[model samples]
Target: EPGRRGSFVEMVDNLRGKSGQGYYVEMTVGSPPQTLNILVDTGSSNFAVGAAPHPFLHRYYQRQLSSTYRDLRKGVYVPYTQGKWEGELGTDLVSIPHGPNVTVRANIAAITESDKFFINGSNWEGILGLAYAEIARPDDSLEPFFDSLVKQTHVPNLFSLQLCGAGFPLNQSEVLASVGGSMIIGGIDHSLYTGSLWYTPIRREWYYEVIIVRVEINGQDLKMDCKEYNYDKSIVDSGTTNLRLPKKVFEAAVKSIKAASSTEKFPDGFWLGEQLVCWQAGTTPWNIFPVISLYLMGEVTNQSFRITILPQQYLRPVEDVATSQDDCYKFAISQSSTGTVMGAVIMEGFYVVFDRARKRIGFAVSACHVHDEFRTAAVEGPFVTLDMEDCGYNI
Candidate 1:
């Protein structure tokens, strides 16, 4: 049986991408616990491992090593934007290392073959999906890791995440090595955030999607004359390293940001292939940058929530790979081809909560410091409290 609660902190590994694009959790599989680093993703639902010839640190799951392994005699094919995976389905004991280490029997996708994926030397042996089962792989749709944790182990239906930023030097070996945060399973860390949490109804359960009623820049609401800004819904995804918006909206945002800045802006290259807008290193007058806020609609109810992004959150510094000494501040947003996505870069300063039981999400300005106010809750916690003082932090 699994415990009522569990909490695991995030470990930053730059092997995934430059500037620490991957956030992982340590988990052991099978009976004797074949430990491996699994990428924590909220954008997809399906737990799958690398093929037989896996990397050294992220070794393939050898079924012969555990007595609890069982083959389901079925295969699955999953496709991503950059790669695809083909694998067999099975069952095993999945353990999350926390207090007493919670373990539960769950389905696993033992990948046998892959193309252009899982070969980035990312140090991630597998991916543990946390999204709803609706978007799971066809023919292999089953309860996700978090869902299994709740059903098989009696864990709570809530999960919280706090991601770190790329603040280290470019010459540094492990830029994200010192960066750390927590992933509270079945609960939230109250001390991780200050003020009240703003809850927005989930427009779609597939990927923590929400409705955006308005987008304001420089204290001015961007014109909604274009259909692009009036999107049907937006997804908050930790798996993505940069914020992505519709092409029109992306351009408009850049224009607004430029008009508001007093100093000249310069162009920069890929922070991982996406076009970036950067300013002179350490020369950005952050106070002059526009303040962006998003108003989201609630599901069924008439209530709405607001997520404000201060300049600091979107404006970050990174070392230029070409010239290690040259660094620049880059806007963590890009143009998206598959709709809008709020990725890790913009989410680093916010304490986000995924309330599965209520079908809603919550966010607040994160404290961004190590604290001790996290544990499982008996009931679904408060979504928006009217009394807590708002810290009024920027994105």
Candidate 2:
């Protein structure tokens, strides 16, 4: 069943909410193999799974059930802004069901208790972090899942992501788990993307950080100071739902969008996340919306690459209703005081390669970004770029 030595392709499922929310993949663990739908999160480092039965969870990892599971006896604590999780470290045989074809003993966490981290609507049982060990909890010495997978298997040190939820109306009938796209470990699958891959240097390995040079609406630059995009830190976060822009940058973008949608009654409540705006099933207005472009500092000097997300990507269809039969949508870009977090809404457009070996990330137009009319996403311009020494990092 295996065609390649290193490449492992795992089909992923989309977990939708008020935005192009999340993608999780089915993988197996332990000697007998316990299947779990783990959320694919690039912003995090720990691979933690729900181990105890909780009110909100439908499935949890039973450590006693796995003969290979070793309770490493170290307390693991991961604190987020809105939630926190309590767990202990462990190691077990882990492998992607549709991938690598080689099971490897890997580090994992058995989450016994968590607060506000798990929601009933979430179809995933755990969070599989695909980031660096530099941000690992308890200490940076702990090896992350992806790194362990590569080391144990001797797989190539790169992976790719293609998020294909190109503003499709949320099908309310199905369970939240639906085919989103695929993730390839060890190499890039050329079939999943179009055009040349635009490579960007990862300024820091801690969070897959990249430098933003400018932002554009339709073809016009916001013209605000470029620092606004990198006010604190700018990184690509797959776990986050929306493309969160810095405060000043978001405000400017909102103003520009308001000006563009002068006649379309885009409710103030909708922008404030207080209400949902709907369009009668087949009669959605996508023509009036504008293209949003993010220009990132490229790997080469004096060059920058532009990743453009059409309205279809940012104006995400959230909750659809069968009674009214309305295709409801939510604005997926919001204000982030910390910095720019390019979330699912932005990644839905392109096939991104997380190339750790080269310390770079590659972006190409995703093949699955299909629409009835035309492509909903774009990657263009290694144009003349702006200069910045350190993005927004502090020494």
Q: Top model by TM-score, which number?
A: 2
Please give the clash total of every predicted structure, in order. 4, 0
Tens-digit lDDT string for candidate 2 (138-243):
7887799998888888788988887768455544345354467777878787777777789888988898898888788877889976767887889888888888
Report lDDT per candidate. 0.65, 0.79
Best lDDT among the predictions, by candidate number? 2
Candidate 1: segments with Cα more than 4 A from true spot: 1-20, 55-58, 119-121, 169-176, 225-227, 230-232, 268-281, 298-302, 369-395
RMSD of each: 7.7, 3.5
**Candidate 2, lDDT over the whole model:** 0.79
